[PDB]
Amino acid sequence: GRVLLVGKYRYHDLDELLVEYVNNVANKVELMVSHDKFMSDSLDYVKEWLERYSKANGNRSHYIFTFNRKAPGWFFLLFKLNPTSEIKIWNVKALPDGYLLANNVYPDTNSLCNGFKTLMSSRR
Amino acid sequence: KEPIIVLSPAASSLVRMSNVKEFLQEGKFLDPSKEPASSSNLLAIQRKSSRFKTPIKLLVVDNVEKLFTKSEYWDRVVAIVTTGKDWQFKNYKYKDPQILFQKFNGFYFKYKGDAVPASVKSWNVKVLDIDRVERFSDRQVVEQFWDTVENTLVAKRYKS
Amino acid sequence: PLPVNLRRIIQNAQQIFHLDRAKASDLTIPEIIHGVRDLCKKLFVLRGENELIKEAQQNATSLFQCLVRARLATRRILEEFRLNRDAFEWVLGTIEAQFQRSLVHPGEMVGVI
Amino acid sequence: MNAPDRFELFILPDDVPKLKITPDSRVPNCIIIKFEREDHTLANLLREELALYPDVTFVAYKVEHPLFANFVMRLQTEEGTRPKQALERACASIINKLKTLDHKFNEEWNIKN
Amino acid sequence: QVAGLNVNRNPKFWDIESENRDRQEEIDKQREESRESRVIKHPFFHNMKSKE
Amino acid sequence: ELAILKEERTTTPYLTKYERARILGTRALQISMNAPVLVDIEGETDPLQIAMKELSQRKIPLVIRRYLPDGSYEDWGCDELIVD
Q1: Where does it localize (chain A) (predicted)?
Q2: Which of A91, D95, E33, E45 is the most exposed place for a label (fewest CB within 10 A)?
Q3: What would the CATH number be for the domain defined by D1-113?
Q4: Closest residue to B114, CB basis, from F43, F56, F82
Q5: CB contacts < 8 Å between E and F, how many?
């Protein structure tokens, strides 16, 4: 087909679609993986590690990222405010322009972390 | 400051980052479809010429979005490789292909006997043919490409 | 009259690779000898491993091999033409390809011609 | 039998535009103009007028075939000037030249009448 | 105007159920069609299943 | 019996001009008779041009059978014959 649509994104050829969408998504995924707050292990192990780290460091709120094995192309953001606070998981989508969290597009992982902290502060 | 050679990130390109080093430098052409994809978008090659006493070091860049933040980098561009696709030039210095191709050297690589795309014929770019079977002409084609590039380099009075 | 023009090939190589200037060649003598010797065995007019086929194939290219050896001598290559390596493999490949292209095509109605 | 109508030399069909302009991308700031139902009378006038402008670096025309009434003109100006503006300036300048020529001829004819 | 015949369709002497069943049989036969595979020429295109 | 094994094929490995012309004609006719096309067509519409495009990419699904004078023959695929 002369016109290709991937959600709201519109492309004109297979190579254009590939380069503009898939390469950017892969780069953002690598940036998320290379980020200091990433863990590719299983969700239960991520929850256990977060619980242990929060119990050991109950003076701060800890957030980590992990793979969304059920929904490919997504990420689970698990954050625990304190040992007494329940672990809350948020959904992050790997988009070509960045990461979509709470209907907000963040160009980089550090920008995503700053936005998450600002959202937590505002909701608090 | 090393000059820059720009390649098309298109998958149909006959010259990609995976096989650019063996082609432009070593003179041997390999099919890029069979070669594994290269993770690095920056590469460095060495050119030996009779016009220059010493070999010239050049930088090969596939995507200019993350490497052309400054306008002064465009002064180092000595060759542009395109696949005849308009969408390559969305983020370029001259978003119109024509002006880019009068202000820069454009090269299009096609197999011998294949028909040239219409947009390529409407642009000011050189056409370089690579035979599908015989491999001795790869050095000749590379020599033509480097002849054009060296003419541009000498015209720019580059220091090496 | 003989196939594939050698003079044209050599001057094309000289123009392509810029074989002017007093620069010294990097083409060793054994490469020249072995390259020409191997080229004189890849001019296939007849395919097959039969001994009689090999004898006919050797007979069919005697004059042309004499021409090639007369032109691509060691002294002439190093001094008169001043080819370098890359020009030398280019010349050998071009000679082989043009010779293959100059053969007669099965199905010619040569009697009427 | 196959002779075309003579009025086709100057009568323009409705679907055929009198003047089609297409850019020439091989060189910067160049256009190709196709005049329909015209010949050397307009073409040579325009060409020799434009050749004198300092900002016009290339101007030429050709009639592809005498049996077809059209010609194609190539124009290529400096960086500052758009070629179509140069063509308009040429047309206006020739019009003024013809106007003053007519006025002077009328004066002379009245004097010598 | 399709069933222009005046044939008495009394259930006592006419098997309406059989004719109806045959009618959905033939209508489902009409719904039945054919499909074939798609061929695309692209370096990164491969005719594979999801698991494949 | 009459067929010659692939290992002992001694004819030329190149597509002669007569074979090229006949292959192009047959493929063009078949395409004009609504045969499937094995290459992607950008904007081409002429059957002969599509056939030439197929031949350049070694995608023509035809076999050349070369008849030796004694009656034996060699079967060459158009995908394994070298074309200039």
Answers
A1: Chromosome; Nucleus
A2: E33
A3: 3.30.1360.10
A4: F56
A5: 6
